[PDB]
Write a protein that binds this ligand. Structure first.
Ligand SMILES: CCNC(=O)COc1ccc(Cl)cc1CNC(=O)[C@@H]1CCCN1C(=O)[C@H](N)C1CCCCC1
Lengths: 11, 276
């Protein structure tokens, strides 16, 4: 149930 | 400047339960945290799948302290590296991306204590994480202090209450927001006599006795989180322990075990000054 975080941190 | 919270000490405001802590200086059954109540609380987050791994704490603008089993635990085939996780600081909500509030950091290197004992009793359950770039403090992000021998000596006493925080399980549903519970430090003998596991000097246990009426404890998901105390001498918050292990959560006659931070400070200092 976690909200989509910014992909900029995922990279 | 560690241990002084922007929204409390710095404004001369007391949080709703700190009085209970100071009065003793002679997460299951916890409550929702207040905004800015634990500005050092850090969430260890897994990218894929996206999930809460553990709690942790901010001890400076570049270092985070956590329990070693959060990263390495062979019995559960757990062995995370830097690229596997993200550090989320300034959080309140467990699941939401708190835009403009929280800060997501990347890890540069992870350091697990060389003598961490995962084979038997999680002895020396401690690890340090160096962030890629310094975090900027705010009203919601501020480091907690690490104890000095004197503060440890005076505060780590049976009966004295500490505070544990985390987004872990509420029962042995996960909370909506950060939970907090205040627990008393327990007498070594009692800790020893409540389990079959061999307790070492690098640990202490906390929680209420079955006859004390009050209860509460950490649980799954709370691991790595801080056990802190407020010094009645300089009014700063100090981290005395790290949520480590238990046999169940909030079971009568059982107690939570925490990594004794001070006992391991020499390792902590060594690593920090050695690796920046
Ligand atoms: C319900 C599942 N969780 C539990 O039983 C314990 O969880 C609690 C309760 C209190 C505290 Cl202070 C910390 C934790 C979270 N820590 C853990 O669950 C860690 C992870 C590795 C195994 N472990 C345990 O607690 C194990 N149950 C211990 C490991 C050491 C030997 C005796 C069993």
């Amino acid at each position: 149930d976690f909200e989509e975080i910014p992909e900029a941190y995922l990279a | 400047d560690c241990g002084l919270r922007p929204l409390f000490e710095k404004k001369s405001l007391e949080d709703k339960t700190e009085r209970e802590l100071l009065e003793s200086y002679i997460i299951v059954e916890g409550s929702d945290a207040e905004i800015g109540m634990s500005p050092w609380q850090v969430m260890l987050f897994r990218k894929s799948p996206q999930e809460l791994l553990c709690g942790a704490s901010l001890i400076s603008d570049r270092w985070v302290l956590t329990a070693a089993h959060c990263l390495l635990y062979p019995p559960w085939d757990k062995n995370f590296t830097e690229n596997d996780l993200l550090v989320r600081i300034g959080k309140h909500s467990r699941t939401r991306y708190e835009r403009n509030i929280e800060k997501i950091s990347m890890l540069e290197k992870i350091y697990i204590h060389p003598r961490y004992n995962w084979r038997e009793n999680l002895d020396r359950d401690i690890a340090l994480m160096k962030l890629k770039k310094p975090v900027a403090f705010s009203d919601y992000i501020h480091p907690v202090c690490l104890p000095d021998r004197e503060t440890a000596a005076s505060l780590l006493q049976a009966g004295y209450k500490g505070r544990v925080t985390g987004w872990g399980n509420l029962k042995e549903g996960q909370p909506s927001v950060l939970q907090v519970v205040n627990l008393p430090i327990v007498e070594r003998p009692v800790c020893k006599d409540s389990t079959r596991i061999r307790i070492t000097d690098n640990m202490f246990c906390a929680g209420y006795k079955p006859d004390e009426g009050k209860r509460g404890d950490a649980c799954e998901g709370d691991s790595g989180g801080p056990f802190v105390m407020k010094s009645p001498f300089n009014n700063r918050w100090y981290q005395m322990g790290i949520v480590s292990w238990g046999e169940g959560c909030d079971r009568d006659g059982k107690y939570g075990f925490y990594t004794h931070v001070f006992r391991l400070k020499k390792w902590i200092q060594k690593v920090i000054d050695q690796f920046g």
